[PDB]
Amino acid sequence: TLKSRPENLSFARCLNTTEAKFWQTDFLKRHTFKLPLLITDSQSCTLSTECDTLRIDFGIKVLPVKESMYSCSDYNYRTAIYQKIDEYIAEDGFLTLAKRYVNNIANARFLWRNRKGAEIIETIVTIEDKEYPSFNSKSFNLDTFVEDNATINEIAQQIADTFAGKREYLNIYVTCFVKIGCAMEVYPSQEMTFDDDDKGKKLFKFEGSAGMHSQKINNALRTIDTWYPDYTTYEFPIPVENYGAARSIGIPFRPDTKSFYKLIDRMILKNEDLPIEDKHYVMAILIRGGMFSKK
Amino acid sequence: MFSQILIIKPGTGISPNIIISEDIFPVLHSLFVEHDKKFGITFPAYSFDKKGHLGNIIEVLSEDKEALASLCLEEHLAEVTDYVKVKKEITFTDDYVLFKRIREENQYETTARRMRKRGHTELGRPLEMHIKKKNQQIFCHAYIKVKSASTGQSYNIFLAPTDIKHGSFSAYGLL
Amino acid sequence: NGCLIDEALLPLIIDEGKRKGEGNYRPRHLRDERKEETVQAFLDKYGYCNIPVGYEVHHIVPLSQGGADSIKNMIMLSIEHHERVTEAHASYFK
C-alpha cells in the first residue's frame, strides 16, 4: 500500500537515436559511391547539378525497459513498477509498440518535409550482421498501421525481445534513398540561434555535411499514439507527451484524468486495473523516458 | 452556388501554406484556365488579428454542378492523398464569403525604370516613401506564393475578404 | 502623419530608448499604468479613430524603465519594426 510518488523518480530513454547525415548520390548506381553534401550560403542546402538522389544514414540503440530506470527513492515503488512491467510482459509482451515503431520506420516518417514530392523512396534496415529487404515507403500511409508484413513482424519481434527481458541491447542501422530530382532543395535541421545581431536561418552541420538532429527523428518515430480521447473527431496519430500535447492543433489533448500522472496514480497508488489502451500508453511513456517527480 | 470542400490533413509536420502553394494552387489554376473561367476559391477559416490566417479548410465554388462534376478533382489530386482530403459530396450552400485580390507595389528599381520611360518627374528622395506606406498595409495580409510558368518569376499574391457576392472572379479563382 | 515610415530612423529611436532607461527598472506597483484613454486621445488628436491596419502602438521610453504614458512618449509603427525594437530592448535589458 502506497500513498504518493517518491520525491525523486526518473527514467532514461530506451530508444537512443544517432544524428542523421546527408550523402548525395545517384539512384542508378547507389551501391557504388556517395558524395558529401554541404551547407552553401541566410544559409541553404541544395543538391549539385550532377546528382539526383539523397541518402540519410542513422542508427537506433534499443535497451530493456526494466534496466532503464535511473533514480527512484522508494524500494516499494520500484518493486511495484517491476511487477507491473512483468505483468505487461506476461500479457502483451511489448509487441504492439514494437510493431508501431517499426511501422513508423517503414513509412519513412522521419524524412519530414523531404518526404513530400518524392518520386522514389527506399528504406533498408540492417541488423547486427544481416540486412532486410528494401521498403517501398510510398505505399505506406501516415494514418493506418500495417500488421501483416513479414519483415515488419521479424524486426518487431527482435525489438520486443530486446525490450522485455530477452536480449540486453540492440543496434539498428537505417539507410534511406529519396529521389527528389536533379538540382533540388533539401531541408536539414535548423539551429536555435541565440545571438541577437543577426537572425538569418542557420542549418545543421554534422561532420561537415548536413543532417537532422536526433530529437527530430526521435519525435518522428514516437508518433504512434492513437489511443487518446476524441480520436474519431481528429483521426491522426500524435506523439507521446505527458499531457498529450502537439503543435499542429495547439490543444492539450489530455488535460484531464487521461493524462499520464492520473493514469500512473490509478495504476500504482490504488492498484486499480486499467484498459489495455491505458497500459499501452503508459508503456509508451515509460519507453520514451523522462522525469516524473512529486512537488 | 455549388461548393466543393478540401481539407489539409493535420499532423504531417508540414505547414498548410506550403501544401496550398505547392500542389493545390498550381493545379487549381491549371484547370481554372482549362475550364474557361467559371470557378472561384474561398477559405472558410480566415481569422484576422495581426496577419493572414488562411488556415486549414479550402473551398472551390461554381455556378453550375456539372462544371464541378467535369472538374474531376479526384483523379487530378490522387497523388498527395496522404496530405489532402477531397470529399465527393458537392452540395448547395448559401453562406459563402468571397475574397478579392489586392495589388502590391513594385520596388525602387522597377518603378524608377517605369518613371524614366514615362514622363519622368524625378522625385527620387520621397518616391519610395509613397510606395512604402502602401506596402506597410499589403504586407499584413494573407498571401500565396506562385511560380509563374509563362514569365519565369515568383510573387506573393495577396488576398482579403469582400462583401460582394457575384461577378466574374478571375482566372486564378480569386477576385 | 505619425507612423515610422523610413528604415533609416529606427537606430535613433533605439538609441533614445537605450540611453534613457538604464538603472530605472522598477516593479509593477511602481510602474506607471498604461491607460486606454491616452492612446485614444492620441489618435483623436492625430486624426484617427482606430489604429490603422499594419501598425501597433509603441512607447519610445519603456514604461518598465521609468517611462511615462502620454502623447509625447508614444509612436505608431509597423509590426516588423515593433518586434525588432522589442528584441533589441530585450537584448539590452533582459
Q: DSSP per residue over chain C, as a string?
A: --B---STTHHHHHHHHHSSSTT----TTTSPPP-HHHHHHHHHHTT-SSPPTTEEEE-SS-GGGT---SSSS-EEEEHHHHHHHHHHHHHHT-
CB A56 within 8 A of CB A18: no
Cβ neighbours of C80 (radius 10 Å): 12
Buried b (16+ CB within 10 A) or exposed e, A141-170: ebeebeeebeebeebbbbbbbbbbeeeeeb
Q: Which residues does a chain break follow in chain A (C to N more than 2.5 Å)?
A: 41
Cα C48 from Cα C43, distance rounded (Å):
5
Grid cell in block for residue C10:
529606427
Q: How far is Cα B71 from Cα B49, in angstroms, rounded to an integer?
A: 35
A195 at the C interface (CB within 8 A)?
Answer: no
Q: Is B10 on the interface with A (CB under 8 A)?
A: yes
Spatial neighbors of A36 by CB under 8 A, at least 6 apart, are A23, A24, A208, A209
Give the angle subtended at the CA of B80 by the CAs of B54 and B43, to the nearest 5°.
20
> In Å, how far is B89's CA from the nearest CA of chain C?
38
Distances (CA, A) of B31 to A149, B157, C47: 40, 19, 48
Query: Is any Cβ of chain B less than 8 angstroms from the Cβ of C42?
Result: no
* Residue among A118, A138, A122, A121 at smallest CA distance from A185: A118
Closest partner residue to B140 (CB to CB) among C3, C6, C53 is: C53
Interface test mutation site (partner A, options B14, B17, B22, B47, max chain A beta carbons within 10 A): B14
CA angle (A194 as vertex; A188, A195 as ends), nearest 5? 110
How far apart are the C-alpha atoms of C57 and C47, rounded to whole Å? 15
Distance from CA of A188 to the nearest CA of C (A): 26
Task: Look at strands B84-86 and B39-42 and give their pairing.
Answer: unpaired
Residue tagged 516518417 (cell numbers):
A109
* Contact assessment for residue A130 and residue A164, using Cβ atoms and an 8 Å cutoff: no
Cβ distance of B133 and C78 shorter than 8 Å: no
* CA angle C14–C19–C20, rounded 5-degree value: 100
Mind telling me how many Å the CA of C5 is from chain B's nearest CA?
A: 6
Work out the burial of residue A279: count CB atoms within 10 Å of its CB; fewer than 13 is exposed, 13-18 middle, 19 or more buried. buried
Amino acid sitting at position A29:
K
> Is there a contact between A98 and A159 (Cβ–Cβ < 8 Å)?
yes
Query: Which residue's C-alpha cell is 518535409?
Result: A113
CA distance A197 to C80: 16
SS3 B114: helix
d(CA B112, CA B36): 36
Cβ contact B135:B104 at 8 Å: yes
Which residue in the block uniquely carries the three cell numbers 468571397? B98
How long is chain B? 175
CA dist A190 → A213, A219, A277, B17, C80 (Å): 9, 15, 36, 19, 22
Contact B133 C5 (CB under 8 A): yes
Reading phi first (left if > 0) and then psi (alpha if -120 to 50, else beta), residue A117 is in left
Closest CA to C31 of C60, C57, C59, C62: C62
Beta bridge partners of A225: A238
B72: left (phi over 0), alpha (psi -120 to 50) or beta: left
Q: Residue A261: name the closest of A237, A289, A282, A246 by CA.
A: A282
B111: left (phi over 0), alpha (psi -120 to 50) or beta: alpha
The number of C-alpha atoms within 13 Å of A61 and in the hemisphere containing its C-beta is: 11
Under 8 Å between Cβ of C87 and A193: no
Between CA B82 and CA B86 the distance in angstroms is: 11
Q: Which among C62, C64, C86, C85 has a CA at the least distance from the CA of C74? A: C62
Inter-chain residue contact A236 with B80, CB threshold 8 Å: no
**Partner-chain contact B22 A116, CB within 8 Å:** yes
Could you tell me if residue B152 is left (phi over 0), alpha (psi between -120 and 50 degrees) or otherwise beta?
Answer: left
Q: Is B118 helix (H, G, I), strand (E, B) or coil?
A: coil
Q: Which chains touch C (3 or more CB pairs under 8 A)?
A: A, B
Indicate yes or no: CB of B82 within 8 angstroms of CB of A143: yes
B133 and chain C in contact, CB less than 8 A: yes
Q: Which residues of A touch B12 (CB under 8 A)?
A: 142, 248
Contacts (Cβ under 8 Å, ≥6 apart) of A90? none
Closest B-chain CA to A141: B82
- Shortest CA distance from C88: residue in chain A: A196
| Cβ contact, residue pair A249, B10, below 8 Å | yes
What are the Cα distances from residue C71, in Å, to A73, B64, C44, C45, C74? 61, 57, 11, 9, 6
Method: cryo-EM
Smallest CA-to-CA distance from A43 within A207, A216, A182, A198 is with A198
CA distances from A116 to A30, A295, B3, B23, C12 (A): 21, 44, 28, 10, 46
Residue B24 Cα, gap to closest chain A Cα (Å): 13
Full DSSP string of B22-63: HHTHHHHHHHHHHTTS-EEEE-TT---SSS----S-EEEEES
Whether residue A7 contacts residue A294, with contact meaning beta carbons closer than 8 Å, is answered with yes
Q: Are A68 and A211 in contact (CB under 8 A)?
A: no
Q: What residue of A is the nearest CA neighbor of C90?
A: A196
Residues of C in contact with B129 (CB under 8 A): 5-6
Rounded CA-CA distance B25/B19 in Å is: 9
Chains in contact with A via at least 3 Cβ–Cβ pairs below 8 Å: B, C
Q: What is the DSSP letter of B9?
A: P
For residue B20, the surrounding DSSP H or E stretch is helix B16-23
Q: Which residue of B has its CA nearest to C3?
A: B133
Alpha-carbon distance of A223 to A143, in angstroms, equals: 11
Q: How far is A214 from chain C (nearest CA, A)?
A: 30
Which of helix, strand or coil describes residue B76?
Answer: helix
C-alpha cell at A90: 506476461
C-alpha B40/C-alpha B63 separation (Å) is: 9
Residue B121: strand, helix, or coil: coil
* First-last CA distance in chain C: 32
Chain B residues with beta carbon closer than 8 angstroms to that of A116: 14, 18-19, 22, 80, 83
Q: Can you tell me the distance from the alpha carbon of A189 to that of C37, in angstroms, rounded to the nearest whole number?
A: 47
DSSP chain A: ---S--SSEEE--SEEEPPP-EEEE-STTTTT--EE-B-B---B-B--TT--EEEEEEEEEE--SGGGEEEES-HHHHHHHHHHHHHHHHHT-SHHHHHHHHHHHHTTGGGGGGGTT-S-EEEEEE-SS-B---EEGGG--SSS-----HHHHHHHHHHHHHHHTS-S-EEEEEEEEE---TT-B----B-----SS-----B-EETTEE---HHHHHHHHH--B--STTHHHH---B---TT---SSS---S--STTSHHHHHIIIIIS-----HHHHHHHHHHHHH--B----
Nearest-Å Rg of the Cα atoms of chain C is 13
CB contact under 8 A, B136 and C6: no
Resolution at which this structure was determined, Å: 3.4
> Phi and psi dihedrals of A205, rounded to 5?
-110, 120
CA neighbours within 13 Å on the CB side: how many for B147? 9
- Contact flag A223-B11 (C-beta cutoff 8 Å): yes
- What's the farthest any 2 CA atoms get from each other in chain A? 68
How far off is chain A from B18, nearest CA to CA, in Å?
Answer: 10
Beta bridge partners of B157: B144
Radius of gyration of chain B (CA): 19
